[PDB]
Amino acid sequence: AQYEDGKQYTTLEKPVAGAPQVLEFFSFFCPHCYQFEEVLHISDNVKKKLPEGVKMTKYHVNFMGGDLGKDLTQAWAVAMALGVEDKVTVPLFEGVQKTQTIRSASDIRDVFINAGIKGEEYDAAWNSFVVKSLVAQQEKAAADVQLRGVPAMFVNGKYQLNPQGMDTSNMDVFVQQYADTVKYLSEK
Numbered sequence: 001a002q003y004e005d006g007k008q009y010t011t012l013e014k015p016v017a018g019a020p021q022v023l024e025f026f027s028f029f030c031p032h033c034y035q036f037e038e039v040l041h042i043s044d045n046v047k048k049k050l051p052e053g054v055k056m057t058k059y060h061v062n063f064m065g066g067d068l069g070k071d072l073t074q075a076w077a078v079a080m081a082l083g084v085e086d087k088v089t090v091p092l093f094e095g096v097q098k099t100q101t102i103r104s105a106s107d108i109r110d111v112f113i114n115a116g117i118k119g120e121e122y123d124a125a126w127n128s129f130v131v132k133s134l135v136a137q138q139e140k141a142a143a144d145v146q147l148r149g150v151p152a153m154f155v156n157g158k159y160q161l162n163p164q165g166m167d168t169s170n171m172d173v174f175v176q177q178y179a180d181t182v183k184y185l186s187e188k
Contacts, residue, residue, distance in 0.1 A: 007165040008181045012158055016144040019157025020057035022050065022182060025142060028072045028096045029065035030150045038093055040171060042151070045179045054186055058085070059138040061150055065096075071105045072096075077134035078112070078125045087115045155185040 005011050024043060026033040036042040047056060060076035062069050072092070079085045091111045095102035102108055112122045125131055145154055153161040161181065168174050 003181065003184050007162065008177075009155075009159045009162050009185060012145065012154075012160060014146075016154075016157030019141070019144065019154065021054045021156055021186065022046065022056040023141060023154045023157075024056065024058040025061050025147055025150045025152045026058065027061050027064040027069065027150050028092050028102075029069060031097065033151045034093050034097050036151045037089065040175050042175060042178060045175050046153075046182050049179045049183045051183070051186055057141075059141055061142055061147065062139065063148070064150070068102070068104070068108075071108055073138055074126065074131065074135055075105075075108045075112070077131045077138065078122065080134055081125050081128070081131050082117060082121070084112070084115065084117060087117075088112055091115065153182065155182060155188075159185045159188070161185075 026036070043056065043058060050056070060073040062073050065072065079088050088111055091114065092102070095107065095111055102111070109122060113119055161178065163178060166174050166177050
């Protein structure tokens with residue numbers, strides 16, 4: 001057919017109950033993730049094509065970058081709790097991968113400050129139980145799908161995007177194939 005299991009997507013032999021409708025995993029250490037976000041704008045083009053009523057979720061992962069990797073998962077929980085994802089995503093990606101000026105939890109914090117989040121507000125969030133549970137949620141979602149690489153996207157805890165079964169000659173075409181595939185899977 002046009003969309004084939006094993007080609008543009010795979011099916012989880014072990015489906016995950018109660019999963020978010022569209023769930024994306026990434027790491028700020030992840031070079032393809034930088035491309036996805038900063039160059040391809042995958043998350044955004046997927047949104048543009050999703051049906052009525054389907055929300056997207058994006059989680060950070062621990063398994064890249066060691067200690068700073070875990071700090072970034074906690075900062076992303078802070079970003080989600082404060083709703084400032086669209087203000088820190090670019091400076092966090094460039095800080096880790098472009099300028100390489102993020103080397104510590106303090107440097108991560110600087111990005112939020114520079115983005116206009118008050119220190120007292122950032123510190124309160126960082127240390128909060130609501131952020132701890134949001135860290136736990138990110139960790140659980142990754143564990144539920146046995147996640148060992150990013151970027152990754154899952155639809156309804158049943159399907160996993162398979163971008164390798166796509167052409168990259170033209171960047172624009174790949175992004176839309178990716179987005180169209182997510183829409184197809186959502187409507188399944």
